[PDB]
């Protein structure tokens, strides 16, 4: 019967992160998941931009990337539908035609500016061939404090999981969950609302049941890791894949089936204290991303968190094609962007109408 006086923070039950931004993180997460609004994901890398610029024959320079982001960020009216914008590091410091930096522009218009803080995919080394980890935790606190200082209030970090032969290795399940959890807690210490993105990729021949079972296994480990690292649940967001059949599976699913597989999977693993889920569009068409999100906001299943969007291709694909990289195409590009923004805004409310959307 020997006793020692210890710090409460040395006891396992008191591992919750102490951050002075807790109240602001919670308010930011509420703002980001406001009814009828979602996130614009404009954080493509310089490499990814060459694949976006291929079809339109636009040169991949820092200035053309600026015009690409300006096509949407200097478009009037998107604050009706977009609550936040995930920015690339380059765009955070670029200037709008209004004379302000893009974080300043988004902050003048009530839109929360965010930043992609991960440093890209690398080979996992452990596990099976083709599986990947995400780099970027070295020097993270220094980077995040600078993003907060220049106006960012949330961030995004993406890990991926490759379904191969109907399964994933246990190495990638543990490691990527551990990476996401450490990233989340460092972000909240620096005042950025972390968007945790564990993407079970669409590539492969797996059916919707394989995706359902892998997704639940992956997301459950992410949640466990978040508990272990002491995340502030009320100031955190999840950016998962939807549960859909594999891209080369040959199987198809209706919006209501995708809604049932996705919500029932989330309801099994995701604590209701988490304010919001911002779905990634991944390998879905523009129309499919709107109807699927609409189906989930009409689901009878339990869904205490807000179900909204964090779309990249599903908001810009038609916009880039109408723009063509030419100043004459700006009007047509912004018409396509704003139509997609309004469709997904209505999808968030569950009142999306397929007849008001594009033809097939």
């Amino acid at each position: 019967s020997r006793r020692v006086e210890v710090l409460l923070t040395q006891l396992p039950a008191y591992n919750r992160l102490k951050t002075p931004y807790e109240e602001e993180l919670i308010e930011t997460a509420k703002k980001m998941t406001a009814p009828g609004k979602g996130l614009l994901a404009a954080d493509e890398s310089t490499g990814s931009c060459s694949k976006r610029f291929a079809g339109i024959g636009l040169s991949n320079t820092a200035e053309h990337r600026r015009q690409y982001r300006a096509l949407m960020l200097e478009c009037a009216g998107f604050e009706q539908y977009i609550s936040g914008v995930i920015l690339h590091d380059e765009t955070v410091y670029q200037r709008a035609s209004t004379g302000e930096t893009f974080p300043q522009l988004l902050r003048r218009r009530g839109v929360v500016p965010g930043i992609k803080t991960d440093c890209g995919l690398e080979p996992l080394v452990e596990g099976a061939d083709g599986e990947q980890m995400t780099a970027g935790l070295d020097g993270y606190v220094k980077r995040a404090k600078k993003y907060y200082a220049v106006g960012c209030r949330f961030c995004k970090w993406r890990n991926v999981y490759k379904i191969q032969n109907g399964t994933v290795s246990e190495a990638v399940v543990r490691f990527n969950a551990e990476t996401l959890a450490r990233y989340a807690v460092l972000s909240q210490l620096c005042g950025l609302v972390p968007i945790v993105e564990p993407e079970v990729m669409i590539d492969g021949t797996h059916d919707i049941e394989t995706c359902q079972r892998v997704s639940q296994h992956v997301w459950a480990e992410v949640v466990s890791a978040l508990h272990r690292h002491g995340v502030v649940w009320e100031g955190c967001l999840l950016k998962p894949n939807m549960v859909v059949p594999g891209a080369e599976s040959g199987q198809t699913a209706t919006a209501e089936q995708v809604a049932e597989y996705t919500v029932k999977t989330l309801a099994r693993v995701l604590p209701p204290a988490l304010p919001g889920v911002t779905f990634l569009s991944g390998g879905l068409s523009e129309v499919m991303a709107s109807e699927y999100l609409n189906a989930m906001n009409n689901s009878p299943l339990p869904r205490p968190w807000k179900l909204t969007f964090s779309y990249a291709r599903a908001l810009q694909s038609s916009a880039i094609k109408a723009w063509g990289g030419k100043s004459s195409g700006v009007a047509a590009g912004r018409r396509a962007f704003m139509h997609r923004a309004k469709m997904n805004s209505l999808a968030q409310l569950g009142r999306y109408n397929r007849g008001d959307d594009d033809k097939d």
Partner: nanobody
Amino acid sequence: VQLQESGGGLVQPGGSLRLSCAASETALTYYAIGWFRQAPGKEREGVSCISRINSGSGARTDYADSVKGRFTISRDDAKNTVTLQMNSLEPEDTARYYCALDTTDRYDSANGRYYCTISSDTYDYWGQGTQVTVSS
């Protein structure tokens, strides 16, 4: 998406009309709004613009030279409408009048104010128009 113009008609010279611009599924408070007109056999010309409301000095306006002093543009963000009060109409004012939204974020950070332009390069969502004929 499209705006709805109303208020036009046939008047004698020196008379007045009040054109109204309405929007169903768009919140006009987020846009600068412009009135334009096109006469048969001519190009489409800007008549009046109004910026977004600046919380300290209200919204900014501008007019084509040919209408200054006679036309007045206003906006009601609550009723979600933009109005053009046209006074002392001459027969050279006869045209089809259009409403449009400025799809560009018209902010001037040097002066800290929203502004507008009489141009039309960045305007979109033109309505079907309303005919205004001033004739004896």
